[PDB]
Amino acid sequence: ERGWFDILDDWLKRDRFVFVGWSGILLFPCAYLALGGWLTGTTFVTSWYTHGLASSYLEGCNFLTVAVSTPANSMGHSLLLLWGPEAQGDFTRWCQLGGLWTFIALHGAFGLIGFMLRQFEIARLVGVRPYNAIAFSAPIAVFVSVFLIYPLGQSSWFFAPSFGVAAIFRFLLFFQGFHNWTLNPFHMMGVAGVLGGALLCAIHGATVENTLFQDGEGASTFRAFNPTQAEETYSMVTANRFWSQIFGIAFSNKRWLHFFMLFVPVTGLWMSAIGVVGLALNLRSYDFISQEIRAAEDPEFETFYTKNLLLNEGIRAWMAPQDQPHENFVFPEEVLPRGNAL
Amino acid sequence: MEVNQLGLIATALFVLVPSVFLIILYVQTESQQ
Amino acid sequence: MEVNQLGLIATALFVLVPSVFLIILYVQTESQQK
Amino acid sequence: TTGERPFSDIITSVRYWVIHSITIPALFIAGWLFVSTGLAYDVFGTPRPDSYYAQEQRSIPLVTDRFEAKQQVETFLEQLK
Amino acid sequence: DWRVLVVLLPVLLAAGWAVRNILPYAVKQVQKLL
Amino acid sequence: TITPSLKGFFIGLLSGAVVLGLTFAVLIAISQIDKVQR
Amino acid sequence: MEPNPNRQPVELNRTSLYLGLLLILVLALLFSSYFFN
Amino acid sequence: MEPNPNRQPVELNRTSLYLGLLLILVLALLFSSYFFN
Amino acid sequence: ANLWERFCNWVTSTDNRLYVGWFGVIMIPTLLAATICFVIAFIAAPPVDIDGIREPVSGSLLYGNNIITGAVVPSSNAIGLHFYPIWEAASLDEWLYNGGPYQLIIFHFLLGASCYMGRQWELSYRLGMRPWICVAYSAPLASAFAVFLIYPIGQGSFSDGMPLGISGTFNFMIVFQAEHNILMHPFHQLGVAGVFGGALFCAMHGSLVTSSLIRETTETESANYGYKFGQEEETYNIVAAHGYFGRLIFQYASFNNSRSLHFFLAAWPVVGVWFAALGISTMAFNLNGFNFNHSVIDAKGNVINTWADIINRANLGMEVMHERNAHNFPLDLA
Amino acid sequence: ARRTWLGDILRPLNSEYGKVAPGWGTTPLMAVFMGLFLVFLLIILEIYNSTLILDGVNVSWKA
Amino acid sequence: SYPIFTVRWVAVHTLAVPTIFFLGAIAAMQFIQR
Amino acid sequence: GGRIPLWIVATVAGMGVIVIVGLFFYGAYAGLGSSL
Amino acid sequence: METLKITVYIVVTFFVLLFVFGFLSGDPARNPKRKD
Amino acid sequence: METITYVFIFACIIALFFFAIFFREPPRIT
Amino acid sequence: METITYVFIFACIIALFFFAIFFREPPRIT
Ligand code: CLA
Ligand SMILES: CC(C)=CCC/C(C)=C/CC/C(C)=C\CC/C(C)=C/CC/C(C)=C/CC/C(C)=C/CC/C(C)=C/CC/C(C)=C/CC/C(C)=C/CC1=CC(=O)C(C)=C(C)C1=O
Ligand SMILES: CCCCCCCCCCCCCCCC(=O)OC[C@H](COP(=O)(O)OC[C@@H](O)CO)OC(=O)CCCCCCCCCCCCCCC
Ligand SMILES: CCCCCCCCCCCCCCCC(=O)OC[C@H](COP(=O)(O)OC[C@@H](O)CO)OC(=O)CCCCCCCCCCCCCCC
Ligand SMILES: CC1=C(/C=C/C(C)=C/C=C/C(C)=C/C=C/C=C(C)/C=C/C=C(C)/C=C/C2=C(C)CCCC2(C)C)C(C)(C)CCC1
Ligand SMILES: CCCCCCCCCCCCO[C@@H]1O[C@H](CO)[C@@H](O[C@H]2O[C@H](CO)[C@@H](O)[C@H](O)[C@H]2O)[C@H](O)[C@H]1O
Ligand SMILES: CCCCCCCCCCCCO[C@@H]1O[C@H](CO)[C@@H](O[C@H]2O[C@H](CO)[C@@H](O)[C@H](O)[C@H]2O)[C@H](O)[C@H]1O
Ligand SMILES: CCCCCCCCCCCCO[C@@H]1O[C@H](CO)[C@@H](O[C@H]2O[C@H](CO)[C@@H](O)[C@H](O)[C@H]2O)[C@H](O)[C@H]1O
Ligand SMILES: CCCCCCCS[C@@H]1O[C@H](CO)[C@@H](O)[C@H](O)[C@H]1O
Ligand SMILES: CCCCCCCS[C@@H]1O[C@H](CO)[C@@H](O)[C@H](O)[C@H]1O
Ligand code: OEX
Ligand SMILES: [Ca+2]
Ligand SMILES: [Cl-]
Ligand SMILES: [Cl-]
Ligand SMILES: [Fe+2]
Ligand SMILES: [Mg+2]
Structure with missing residues (x-):
């Protein structure tokens, strides 16, 4: 019969403005704390003791330069719980030690779990297939590989991305100079999936909007659609002929078309995640050995591949002393790699 | 250039094995009914 | 031993190409209407 | 269609603005005072502009020990005074 | 801390102030529920 | 002995139990008060 | 021997052949540089 | 357009598959030593 | 009719397997020329003195490259923006050393791709369609113009155009970051929102339509056979899809109008990529990303670094190393 | 279907498809064990992580 | 007759209440001098 | 119920957004974060 | 080189003239609906 | 052998384009 | 790699024997 579990199930699944669900018990606290943690840190909290950086509006940063920065390298991979052995329950010290970083990363991870459970739960209630939850596995693979696996393979959370606009840009440039990440075929597949997904988004939207049937008298054509109508609002047959004659091939099956729109960006993000798992271990696509053997013996042999390595060497030497303060690097002027004049 | 000597057969089997899988499946579809 | 470095792919394609030809022909015979 | 009162009804009502002409400025002023009194610095441990360095030091106070990190920060802070 | 109360x-x-204005309608909402 | 971090572990465990217990107590209470009509 | 009632015919249409060969060939064009190294 | 009336189905029975694979594999076992040299 | 009329009727014929059209009569020869030169150069061109310092860079497969490292290399800095067709060289050997193939390829490509866009207008007109697919294509097209023509014009040399190759592309990006701080530029940030968002909405729309396909097939066949090309009824239940997505977020955050939805799918990536293209095209005139180097200062005046200052250190490493033999004077002014 | 000597011996082990205990059955007991298991994984995780540090437990090669 | 306090009301104020407080705090920061 | 027209609420709210964002851009040139 | 230059100039002129005279050859009327 | 391999794969792709376009399964209104 | 190749071909031949004998097309009197 209707026990307390079923009575609770009733209330959780009420059709209200913001659906709750069983998944909401996990999703809403964790999403709220991750977002609230980020807003709290970027507004008020420094990175002076972990990075030697200002990182909050309170210190004078703007929206592009605020961040919640990773903990000091000496923390290792500490969970850095507020009640843990590092902060010992002291909220102020916890903030100064980087506790908001693991707070956001961990509540964010469980919030993402809660969101994907929500996608399953709602799909089951309204009676649709759960492909939206399936497609969301790609955001999850990215978050887990970049914010958890990658630093877990490295020396500490310090080398995870810090949560901020400019901080993420630094992460990109670090990956170029140290990992040569642009050369990695798993990143290249990710790029193809993202740009190919954006291409499909644009071309499908434009094709539908330009093969519409005239279903009203208005020159603005949005009102000539009824959600309950049975008929296609655009001509698949005309769309197919156009693209066949323009590009050589065209979709003819709308079910395949829309599955392909799931497949392409979702697969790309999954591939990029695999490459980052490799970079967790410094298992890079850094070099082509045949190129290096030839270049070492032949000082006239030059390609764009060898040119980019010189850029990477500059990035490493010029950014490492300030970007890795725990190493206490001191690079005398005379050892810095530089071309002529610059 | 001093390339990896297994790269040629790696690339050749990488192409051939899944391609022939697909060709086998395609041709036996055409021959049905 | 200092073998011919093309012997491996030569042997591999010698087996694979005609074997695959025969498998294609066999499977599409089985799938024909009985 | 989900039973709650429509937002456009709420935010065009006199009672909404009787309440929120007080609560919205009150929160804004509370946030202002959180900074202007300096309390924000002490809650979160953020350096004031005169508290990044002692007068002659030029080395950042980087935490270097995981389990005595709390005492290290405390020592860093004592060296400012 | 004086700053906390400030x-x-x-x-x-x-x-x-919000409770004072919404109290009659709050107790009316809650009275309907029970 | 019970180290400071084991004491901390117990505090974290109790805090999570309290957060979860209060959450479900409130949800169960509301669900019983505002039942769906069938 | 009595036949198995669970058997099903398998199909691959021409478009799927073309899509699959494109995937394989492009993956090969991409990864081959790294196989040769 | 009108279909070509000269088309014929092609067949390879199972025994011919086994005979052909035996021929290919034994030829490979024979010639492989000379390919490696 | 007369031969010119029959010719015009064939050119503009809606029955050709691939549409030709008047834009097509320019597109077809120019794209064939660019393709053929590109393929031959990518395989067999000798090294090119891209930076005008007699330091030739090898781009082709036969000259030591693989697919990832190979490129058609931009024309020499000594040429600058000068027009360098084959007949301006004393010999093909000279033409090749100075990067002549790059100019031939990008100029034929840009012209052909512009005609590709016009051809998309033209066929839509012949088929009785609405006309704006070509406007969506203007976003990638404008981006190609930005990296192959506008950036060279602003910097004064086709040697600074994007190379035609995979690693050459990365070289262009890294040098661009060093010289313009493009990551800190809001038009590039809008570009990222455009392509991240485009990929997101692609996956979203794909997943939502796929989730609400109407049952027309059995468990042992692809659900794709439930749709037949040209059927009049919609193949998925948009009311169910909206009922799902509106509950995922909230009701009014979801599209119930398919025309509105597909307009949004077109507009978001197209507008974002327009701003990407305009980012490159305005950094072409050295209006660069935000510079917050030493923006945060303490009470004494010590610099307090932010993440922007760490970005700056990385940019410096790129700056001091790029084109390591090309600069004689202390400032890189183009 | 084919009977065999071994199949006849094993038949009772594959004869109760679909059999269930009424209602919630042992679910409450299961939940308790799940909760204990969660705490167990949290303990061993925090020991490995050096967030939980116990006397005589040196999480190091120097164990 | 509509309820006043709902789940939606709670969700709205968990976001709106801190947002206005934070905006007042960031406003004050614009007048801080080193 | 509906005594205050929605277009006035939107106009006043929108002007408030412009004022606060304008203040934040002012602060980019003065005090902390100004480089001065 | 001079012969190459002349040849390309003639080729380009040929295709450009096709483009211009083609679009002058009653192009608005080349649609499936109202021709005017 | 590397260059031959790269150009071979590329040539197969171009041939595939030809067949995918001119010898496609024709779209048919059902 | 040579030895692997020889042993692989041999192993394929033995597998072929198994299929040719136990998975032959059965002879049937018509
Ligand atoms: C679904 C909601 C949810 C989830 C999944 C999490 C999850 C997490 N929180 Mg968050 N949090 C939440 C809501 C949530 N939180 C809410 C509502 C608040 C405001 C109060 C917070 C405030 C908060 C803070 C301040 C911190 C966390 C932290 C954490 C992390 C460590 C938690 C831990 O070790 O607890 C362990 C406890 C349990 C797993 C409970 C298990 C209960 C068992 C099954 C029952 C047994 C209880 C037992 C009988 C009690 C005996 C005690 C006795 C022996 C002494 C973890 C990622 C920490 C962090 O992020 O570090 C960086 C941290 O510092 N949370
Ligand atoms: C332990 C404790 C305390 C537990 C308490 C649990 C409990 C009871 C909680 C109750 C909840 C509560 C009281 C408070 C909640 C707290 C809170 C505020 C949490 C915050 C969570 C949070 C920050 C969420 C942010 C996520 C969010 C809203 C993102 C919005 C993203 C966004 C831009 C959305 C929509 C914009 C838009 C135009 C999208 C269109 C995209 C698109 C093209 C879709 C394609 C598409 C669309 C269609 O539409 C249909 C049709 C089809 C075909 C189709 O292709
Ligand atoms: C002016 C003329 C311009 C012509 C240029 C040549 C265009 C070539 C277009 C691709 C042809 C091959 C397509 C094979 C595959 C094929 O035949 O697909 C045909 C397929 C038709 O789909 P249908 O909807 O008809 O199929 C539905 C069901 O049959 C599915 O089972 O089209 C798609 O799936 C579109 C999505 C894939 C689009 C892939 C685009 C790839 C672009 C090229 C990327 C690689 C470049 C490598 C360079 C080295
Ligand atoms: C349904 C067709 C809609 C047509 C327009 C479609 C445009 C495309 C949608 C993009 C715009 C998005 C903004 C909609 C804007 C829009 O369309 O406005 C219309 C909408 C309706 O307002 P009304 O006054 O009609 O309210 C009536 C309802 O409340 C009665 O049930 O206004 C809002 O929803 C305000 C949103 C406040 C929401 C705050 C709630 C915070 C809760 C946080 C949790 C969120 C979900 C958590 C899950 C992670
Ligand atoms: C961490 C933590 C926690 C939590 C807390 C929280 C939950 C908070 C929240 C907070 C919040 C919730 C906040 C908010 C804020 C907001 C803001 C600050 C906003 C701003 C905005 C703006 C500024 C806007 C802008 C714009 C845009 C975006 C677009 C359009 C236009 C404009 C430009 C206007 C606890 C206690 C549990 C524990 C400890 C730790
Ligand atoms: C080195 C790489 C090697 C990769 C090798 C890959 C091997 C792939 C083997 C595919 C096997 C196909 O299996 C084949 O399926 C078809 C249907 O699809 C079956 O065919 C059956 O169904 C069809 C269609 O209704 C009937 O016309 C036919 O009379 C019936 O026998 C064949 O009896 C079976 O032999
Ligand atoms: C790397 C090595 C690659 C080697 C590749 C070798 C390719 C070999 C291609 C074999 C082509 C077989 O060609 C295939 O013949 C069968 C009959 O046999 C035809 O099938 C036709 O006849 C059969 C049998 O009556 C009918 O059931 C079927 O409906 C009809 O279409 C197919 O339409 C055709 O596709
Ligand atoms: C760059 C050099 C070119 C500069 C040219 C400047 C234009 C000055 C006048 C040129 C007029 C060209 O002349 C143009 O071509 C032929 C010549 O009969 C005509 O012929 C055309 O007529 C009809 C119009 O419905 C078409 O359907 C038909 O297929 C086509 O042959 C055009 O109707 C005429 O307008
Ligand atoms: C935490 C939720 C998962 C555990 C659910 C266990 C339910 S336990 C179950 O509950 C019924 C009421 O719901 C009672 O009537 C019944 O007697 C009891 O056995
Ligand atoms: C389609 C390719 C056309 C290329 C024509 C180039 C041929 S160039 C060649 O060499 C000399 C240059 O003037 C002349 O003496 C000679 O007549 C000329 O044919
Ligand atoms: O050429 Mn390519 O890169 Ca445009 O900056 Mn100046 O120049 Mn060179 O240096 Mn940096
Ligand atoms: Ca001062
Ligand atoms: Cl360079
Ligand atoms: Cl110079
Ligand atoms: Fe669609
Ligand atoms: Mg300021």
Whole structure:
């Protein structure tokens, strides 16, 4: 019969403005704390003791330069719980030690779990297939590989991305100079999936909007659609002929078309995640050995591949002393790699 | 250039094995009914 | 031993190409209407 | 269609603005005072502009020990005074 | 800490002011539920 | 002995139990008060 | 021997052949540089 | 357009598959030593 | 009719397997020329003195490259923006050393791709369609113009155009970051929102339509056979899809109008990529990303670094190393 | 279907498809064990992580 | 007759209440001098 | 119920957004974060 | 080189003239609906 | 052998384009 | 690699024997 579990199930699944669900018990606290943690840190909290950086509006940063920065390298991979052995329950010290970083990363991870459970739960209630939850596995693979696996393979959370606009840009440039990440075929597949997904988004939207049937008298054509109508609002047959004659091939099956729109960006993000798992271990696509053997013996042999390595060497030497303060690097002027004049 | 000597057969089997899988499946579809 | 470095792919394609030809022909015979 | 009162009804009502002409400025002023009194610095441990360095030091106070990190920060802070 | 009360009193007076205006309609909403 | 971090572990465990217990107590209470009509 | 009632015919249409060969060939064009190294 | 009336189905029975694979594999076992040299 | 009329009727014929059209009569020869030169150069061109310092860079497969490292290399800095067709060289050997193939390829490509866009207008007109697919294509097209023509014009040399190759592309990006701080530029940030968002909405729309396909097939066949090309009824239940997505977020955050939805799918990536293209095209005139180097200062005046200052250190490493033999004077002014 | 000597011996082990205990059955007991298991994984995780540090437990090669 | 306090009301104020407080704090920061 | 027209609420709210964002851009040139 | 230059100039002129005279050859009327 | 391999794969792709376009399964209104 | 190749071909031949004998097309009197 209707026990307390079923009575609770009733209330959780009420059709209200913001659906709750069983998944909401996990999703809403964790999403709220991750977002609230980020807003709290970027507004008020420094990175002076972990990075030697200002990182909050309170210190004078703007929206592009605020961040919640990773903990000091000496923390290792500490969970850095507020009640843990590092902060010992002291909220102020916890903030100064980087506790908001693991707070956001961990509540964010469980919030993402809660969101994907929500996608399953709602799909089951309204009676649709759960492909939206399936497609969301790609955001999850990215978050887990970049914010958890990658630093877990490295020396500490310090080398995870810090949560901020400019901080993420630094992460990109670090990956170029140290990992040569642009050369990695798993990143290249990710790029193809993202740009190919954006291409499909644009071309499908434009094709539908330009093969519409005239279903009203208005020159603005949005009102000539009824959600309950049975008929296609655009001509698949005309769309197919156009693209066949323009590009050589065209979709003819709308079910395949829309599955392909799931497949392409979702697969790309999954591939990029695999490459980052490799970079967790410094298992890079850094070099082509045949190129290096030839270049070492032949000082006239030059390609764009060898040119980019010189850029990477500059990035490493010029950014490492300030970007890795725990190493206490001191690079005398005379050892810095530089071309002529610059 | 001093390339990896297994790269040629790696690339050749990488192409051939899944391609022939697909060709086998395609041709036996055409021959049905 | 200092073998011919093309012997491996030569042997591999010698087996694979005609074997695959025969498998294609066999499977599409089985799938024909009985 | 989900039973709650429509937002456009709420935010065009006199009672909404009787309440929120007080609560919205009150929160804004509370946030202002959180900074202007300096309390924000002490809650979160953020350096004031005169508290990044002692007068002659030029080395950042980087935490270097995981389990005595709390005492290290405390020592860093004592060296400012 | 005087600063805590200085910051919280604006919000305290706000919550107090909102309850005073919405109280008759609040007890009416809750009375309907039970 | 019970180290400071084991004490901390117990505090974290109790805090999570309290957060979860209060959450479900409130949800169960509301669900019983505002039942769906069938 | 009595036949198995669970058997099903398998199909691959021409478009799927073309899509699959494109995937394989492009993956090969991409990864081959790294196989040769 | 009108279909070509000269088309014929092609067949390879199972025994011919086994005979052909035996021929290919034994030829490979024979010639492989000379390919490696 | 007369031969010119029959010719015009064939050119503009809606029955050709691939549409030709008047834009097509320019597109077809120019794209064939660019393709053929590109393929031959990518395989067999000798090294090119891209930076005008007699330091030739090898781009082709036969000259030591693989697919990832190979490129058609931009024309020499000594040429600058000068027009360098084959007949301006004393010999093909000279033409090749100075990067002549790059100019031939990008100029034929840009012209052909512009005609590709016009051809998309033209066929839509012949088929009785609405006309704006070509406007969506203007976003990638404008981006190609930005990296192959506008950036060279602003910097004064086709040697600074994007190379035609995979690693050459990365070289262009890294040098661009060093010289313009493009990551800190809001038009590039809008570009990222455009392509991240485009990929997101692609996956979203794909997943939502796929989730609400109407049952027309059995468990042992692809659900794709439930749709037949040209059927009049919609193949998925948009009311169910909206009922799902509106509950995922909230009701009014979801599209119930398919025309509105597909307009949004077109507009978001197209507008974002327009701003990407305009980012490159305005950094072409050295209006660069935000510079917050030493923006945060303490009470004494010590610099307090932010993440922007760490970005700056990385940019410096790129700056001091790029084109390591090309600069004689202390400032890189183009 | 084919009977065999071994199949006849094993038949009772594959004869109760679909059999269930009424209602919630042992679910409450299961939940308790799940909760204990969660705490167990949290303990061993925090020991490995050096967030939980116990006397005589040196999480190091120097164990 | 509509309810006043709902789940939606709670969700709205968990976001709106801190947002206005934070915006007042960031406003004050614009007048801080080193 | 509906005594205050929605277009006035939107106009006043929108002007408030412009004022606060304008203040934040002012602060980019003065005090902390100004480089001065 | 001079012969190459002349040849390309003639080729380009040929295709450009096709483009211009083609679009002058009653192009608005080349649609499936109202021709005017 | 590397260059031959790269150009071979590329040539197969171009041939595939030809067949995918001119010898496609024709779209038919059902 | 040579030895692997020889042993692989041999192993394939033995597998072929197994299929040719136990998975032959059965002879049937018509
Ligand atoms: C679904 C909601 C949810 C989830 C999944 C999490 C999850 C997490 N929180 Mg968050 N949090 C939440 C809501 C949530 N939180 C809410 C509502 C608040 C405001 C109060 C917070 C405030 C908060 C803070 C301040 C911190 C966390 C932290 C954490 C992390 C460590 C938690 C831990 O070790 O607890 C362990 C406890 C349990 C797993 C409970 C298990 C209960 C068992 C099954 C029952 C047995 C209880 C037992 C009988 C009690 C005996 C005690 C006795 C022996 C002494 C973890 C990622 C920490 C962090 O992020 O570090 C960086 C941290 O510092 N949370
Ligand atoms: C332990 C404790 C305390 C537990 C308490 C649990 C409990 C009871 C909680 C109750 C909840 C509560 C009281 C408070 C909640 C707290 C809170 C505020 C949490 C915050 C969570 C949070 C920050 C969420 C942010 C996520 C969010 C809203 C993102 C919005 C993203 C966004 C831009 C959305 C929509 C914009 C838009 C135009 C999208 C269109 C995209 C698109 C093209 C879709 C394609 C498409 C669309 C269609 O539409 C249909 C049709 C089809 C075909 C189709 O292709
Ligand atoms: C002016 C003329 C311009 C012509 C240029 C040549 C265009 C070539 C277009 C691709 C042809 C091959 C397509 C094979 C595959 C094929 O035949 O697909 C045909 C397929 C038709 O789909 P249908 O909807 O008809 O199929 C539905 C069901 O049959 C599915 O089972 O089209 C798609 O799936 C579109 C999505 C894939 C689009 C892939 C685009 C790839 C672009 C090229 C990327 C690689 C470049 C490598 C360079 C080295
Ligand atoms: C349904 C067709 C809609 C047509 C327009 C479609 C445009 C495309 C949608 C993009 C715009 C998005 C903004 C909609 C804007 C829009 O369309 O406005 C219309 C909408 C309706 O307002 P009304 O006054 O009609 O309210 C009536 C309802 O409340 C009665 O049930 O206004 C809002 O929803 C305000 C949103 C406040 C929401 C705050 C709630 C915070 C809760 C946080 C949790 C969120 C979900 C958590 C899950 C992670
Ligand atoms: C961490 C933590 C926690 C939590 C807390 C929280 C939950 C908070 C929240 C907070 C919040 C919730 C906040 C908010 C804020 C907001 C803001 C600050 C906003 C701003 C905005 C703006 C500024 C806007 C802008 C714009 C845009 C975006 C677009 C359009 C236009 C404009 C430009 C206007 C606890 C206690 C549990 C524990 C400890 C730790
Ligand atoms: C080195 C790489 C090697 C990769 C090798 C890959 C091997 C792939 C083997 C595919 C096997 C196909 O299996 C084949 O399926 C078809 C249907 O699809 C079956 O065919 C059956 O169904 C069809 C269609 O209704 C009937 O016309 C036919 O009479 C019936 O026998 C064949 O009896 C079976 O032999
Ligand atoms: C790397 C090595 C690659 C080697 C590749 C070798 C390719 C070999 C291609 C074999 C082509 C077989 O060609 C295939 O013949 C069968 C009959 O046999 C035809 O099938 C036709 O006849 C059969 C049998 O009556 C009918 O059931 C079927 O409906 C009809 O279409 C197919 O339409 C055709 O596709
Ligand atoms: C760059 C050099 C070119 C500069 C040219 C400047 C234009 C000055 C006048 C040129 C007029 C060209 O002349 C143009 O071509 C032929 C010549 O009969 C005509 O012929 C055309 O007529 C009809 C119009 O419905 C078409 O359907 C038909 O297929 C086509 O042959 C055009 O109707 C005429 O307008
Ligand atoms: C935490 C939720 C998962 C555990 C659910 C266990 C339910 S336990 C179950 O509950 C019924 C009421 O719901 C009672 O009537 C019944 O007697 C009891 O056995
Ligand atoms: C389609 C390719 C056309 C290329 C024509 C180039 C041929 S160039 C060649 O060499 C000399 C240059 O003037 C002349 O003496 C000679 O007549 C000329 O044919
Ligand atoms: O050429 Mn390519 O890169 Ca445009 O900056 Mn100046 O120049 Mn060179 O240096 Mn940096
Ligand atoms: Ca001062
Ligand atoms: Cl360079
Ligand atoms: Cl110079
Ligand atoms: Fe669609
Ligand atoms: Mg300021």
